[model samples]
Target chain A: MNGIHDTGGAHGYGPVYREPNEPVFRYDWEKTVMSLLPALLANGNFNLDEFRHSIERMGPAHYLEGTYYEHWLHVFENLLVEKGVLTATEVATGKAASGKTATPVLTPAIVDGLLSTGASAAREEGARARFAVGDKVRVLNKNPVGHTRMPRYTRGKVGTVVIDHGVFVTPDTAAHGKGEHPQHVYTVSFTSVELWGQDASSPKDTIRVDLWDDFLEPA
Target chain B: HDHHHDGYQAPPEDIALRVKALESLLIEKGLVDPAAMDLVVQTYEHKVGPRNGAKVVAKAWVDPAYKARLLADGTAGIAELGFSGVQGEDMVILENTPAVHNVFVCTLCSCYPWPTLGLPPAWYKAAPYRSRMVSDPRGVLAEFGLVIPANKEIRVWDTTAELRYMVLPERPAGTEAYSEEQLAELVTRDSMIGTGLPTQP
Candidate 1:
């Protein structure tokens, strides 16, 4: 979906701000949200792809208007009700219905261990890489109305494969209930002019993107 | 909802209330443990930070062999120091040199190496940095107070996959006498992100 979240070259956002020193969580509630994420994810209700899709599915206005964590919180509430873990009435009223029950999979004793051993999407290598380093490839221009990792700017652009990053899970299928469509990922280097025409600021400069094999074809 | 603020606006009170209510509800429902939540908070707050990446950069600065190995295979090289986890299953280290400057951004989403750099900075996850970095990187670098020489070229890496990237910023001059520990102090988070240069010795 061409949502506001796809903020590649669109302009008018003001100057970037910096804090001399920044904290991980500015507010206590942020920590609350952070803690809930791993636990909820471990609860078997949904996966990471589903979590990201929830953010992508948000209304465009809400997507642009909210902070990163705000999107997380919104999805957590939404999934809880959608998965039948918590009712919609419970969320709106801030009160659960009588006799409500939910068994958490991740307990306090194992949170540290679980977090320390993070999840990995890397699967065993399946097929050989179609494109190698120094090979010229063009990004596929097809757009699907589902979750995808291929960005709009790189679509239909030509780039050289600078590095072969091995095979991993493809996001397009993963976002849905489909299995990980494992494919080779490569760092494709594109000139500024190739992506943005003659108006590019620095012709000498280059932009390298980690693109999957399915999104590329021989140039 | 306004984007005019210098930083993120304080989230609404209702959000705080809603989160707290959810936490209590989950805890009551046996769906969450407060102790575990506290650990997750502590992990990001204290256990992990950019200091981890600084140590890697410092080691590379002093050891030529490690630097070569790092450039060859960033994942195994970083794992040499026990830095490997989520968003870091595959790692790529872009070397900065006199003629080339490398910066990193995830134009699609805020994908980063959490094990080495902890949570990404708020500015990194925000819109302006993500959107403007690819097209007008020099302009974006200027906003960060970094001015690259015209002769030097800037290369931006847009992370579109799980392969985490970090810029191995060029070591500053006149630090011949500095120890690895002392050199690490000069390596800032922004330097690794390629937005700012390492502090001069």
Candidate 2:
């Protein structure tokens, strides 16, 4: 989907501010939201893709205005309300209408155990890679209505396949509750001229974007 | 955000209130425990962080075979060092050399290898880094106090796929005889992210 969150190559943002020494969480609420995320994910109500799509679904102004963890808080509230886990009135008033108790799924030890476990996107054997390293391919000009990983800048651009990263979950389907349409992901290398035309800052420069098989066609 | 003349001012009350309210509600509903949330925070702060990535970088710098394996299969190589978990399942190590430079940015969202580097820094997730890194990568690098020669190629890696990237910066000139522990100390968070270079010997 064409969302304002896809800000790659876009301009007008101010300088990248650097603190002399930056701490991870500037405020206590930042820690709360960050910690709440793993606990919420443990409940299995939503996947990472859905978590991201919720943030993307926010209005452009709302999405751009808030801090990073503020966005997470918004999604947490949105998901809870949309899934009928919590009511809008309850969130607003901080008072639960019903005295119902939900079962606890994640515990302290469980959170520690979960952190140790690794999740892999690589699947079992599938179709051989359609394109090999060094093959010329062009990104398919796609504008899907739902979630998509293809950024706006790389759409319809031609590049060379530099690395065949094997098959993995496609975000387009994964974000929509559709199954991981596992497909080949390649690191496509586009020269500066190829992507930004002849007036690019450095003709020798390149941008390597990891694109899925569905987003590419033979040049 | 408005600035006050006084050096110290109160934080945003609304966000703090909302967080307290939500925590209280979750506790009342028996869906969450405060202890568990504290553990998660502790884990990221102390146990998991760029130090883990530093260990990997140090090993690759000292061990030629490990470096070769790391460049070939990033996932298995890093797993051999006991750094493997969520967001690191599909790991890819981009090597930084004299002739080529690589930097990472998730143009869409903040997709980082949390298992290795822990939570991403604020600037990395901010709009400025994500928006400008791809097109004006050199300019962005300059802002970070890292400037590559014009002759050397700059490759901005837009991680759109599930595979996460961590840059394997070139070892400093005088670190050939340094111990892995000492070498690890030289490896900072930004070096792994490609925004900054490893400490000079």
Candidate 3:
């Protein structure tokens, strides 16, 4: 899904601006959207991959137009309904259809523990790495319509494996609920000249991109 | 966005009201706990943030043995400082030296180290930073008021996996007598992100 969310190397976005003494959340509702994520995730409403993909699935125009938390707000409103946990009308009307209050699932103490032992992505699927450190590799050029960690900028670019990060669930499969396609993740280093051509600002500068096993090919 | 003075944009009122309505609906249906929501928000706001990363940087500066362990294995090293949760699960510490500099970004999405660094600032997630950080890093750093010396090589990290990154900025000179706490004060958030330098002693 090569959406506007994939802004790497694309242009016309203007210069970056700084926000001095920036607050953690500018608006009160921003906190509402932020906290809902871990609670919803705790209830097994959606996985992390699905949350990211929902934001990625946003229309290109809307994706660029919305703020970061607004992109998050999109996930809760749509995904909960799509998963049949809440209805669109219920969200719009500000009332539950049946209207029965019950004890909330997440307690304050439990939430504290949730922060201590946070969610993990580690897996032991026993997958072997195809490429090791110092091996030259090229990013696969294929583009899929589903979730992918391989950014469009790195497509067809050459790099060398710097470190192996062991096996983890692949986003391509996990996002769609296909299976835990655990793949070896590695840090691959690409010269700025290789990524941005000979006109690169400095020949010595390099970009280290973390890549999954399936996103690469022997160079 | 143009309505504001570029300092901070006031959020749209309609969206804020709509979020409140949706939250009300969820609560009525027993899907959420208001207390839990507050707890989670408070965690990031009060307990977790860049100050945690600053402590890690300050410790590395004062303790050479700790720096070696941090460079060897970041997750275990950071955990030693009592900062281990969420995005801090799998970590990598990029050390800035006289010969090389390091920075971190997630061009695909804003995958940041939450336990240590808390939430990312707006610019880190904006299109301009993500668009140019990889291809024209020097240009981006220049806009951030950091002009890396030509002698030192730059290494930009795009965190596209579960392994998160935090830059250990080179210790500033003239701090030979400073305690670890005083050194941590000089370690700003941008220094760890590689956008700005630590304050001079």
In angstroms, the error of model 1 at A219 is: 1.4
How would you encode candidate 3's per-residue C-alpha lDDT over B1-201 as one tens digit per residue? 362311234456698887888788888888888899999999988899999999999999999999999999898899898888777788899999899999988888788888779989988877778888998888999998899988789999998889999999988999996899999999999999998899996
Off by over 4 Å in 3: A100-103, B1-10
Candidate 1 residues A1-219, lDDT tens each? 566667887788778877668888877888899778888888877888778778888887666667678878888888778778888887777666764377777877887677756777777875579999999999999777888888888899999999887888888888787888898999999988898889766867889998889999999
**Worst 10 contiguous positions by lDDT, candidate 2 chain B:** B1-10
Q: lDDT per prediction?
A: 0.84, 0.83, 0.86
Which pairs, if any, clash in model 2? none
**Which wins on DockQ, candidate 2 or candidate 3?**
3
Cα-lDDT of candidate 1: 0.84
In CAPRI terms, model 1 is classed as medium
Tens digits of per-residue lDDT for model 1 on B1-201? 444332375566677888888888787777777777787888889988899999999999999999999999888888899887666767889899999999999887688888778998878887888888888899999989899998899999998888888999999999996888999999999999899999997
Top candidate on TM-score is 3
Query: Which tens-of-lDDT digit does each residue in A1-219 have in candidate 3?
Result: 988788789877777887779899888888998998888888788888988999999888667767888888988888888878778888767788887544566778799887777776879874788998999999999889999889898899999999998988888888898987787999999998888888655787999999999899999
The alpha-carbon lDDT assigned to residue B171 of candidate 1 equals: 94
